[PDB]
Amino acid sequence: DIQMTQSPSSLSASVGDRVTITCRASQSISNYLNWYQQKPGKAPKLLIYAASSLQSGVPSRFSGSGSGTDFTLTISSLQPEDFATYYCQQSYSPPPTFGQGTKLEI
Template identity: 35%
Template sequence: MIICLLCYFLTADVSLGIQVHQSPFALTRKVGEHVQLVCNHGQGDYRVMLWYQQRPGENALQLIGYGYVEFKNDSVEEPFRKKHFNLAGDLSGNKAKNGSLFIRNLNAEHTATYFCAASKPQYIKYPPAPDKNLLHSILNSVKGAS
């Protein structure tokens, strides 16, 4: 069986005209093989990189994972960790940013279009939440105050 992967990029701030490059553009691989998709850009203050998957026939994008300044062990969202996905790269400093999406042991469910997105960090007025679900933490603190 042959797996087909298409790659595109997204940018969170189109008005700046930031150039995000993703390669390869399209590829096919056999079941069991490994793939590395690469994303890079030269915008030093865009320290967030996100990877998405869109399955054939679906409109929704699924967040695979993201990095802020660096990719950590928990950069990949839970459903994708079990499916042989891994992220790596360097998003630090004011230099060019690069990141990679690795998919190991390809199988039919990996057939999809993959998107890389770049963004500036978003700052909020609330203290950082201990988990990724910031809205849940804010709501709990509001409930506790009432």
């Protein structure tokens, strides 16, 4: 059914700056998508669980500027913790496919 990709491959930034990341896929996804982060080898953590909705207990350091498909996530006042690798993932159909990820540098 759906292939995915995620862009750009990496970015460099400063603490407190604003930075934006994009999902892309073969099809309309009807906002059924999630976003995650990790430091390499650590357990990942979710930020956003739709095209835009922020998970409870995650701070307002993120927003999902997207709709339908090929979404974007923005960092909002970049934390040193946002040095993490970021992943998108479609939930629209099985298997719940992830993007290739992206890296932010401080």
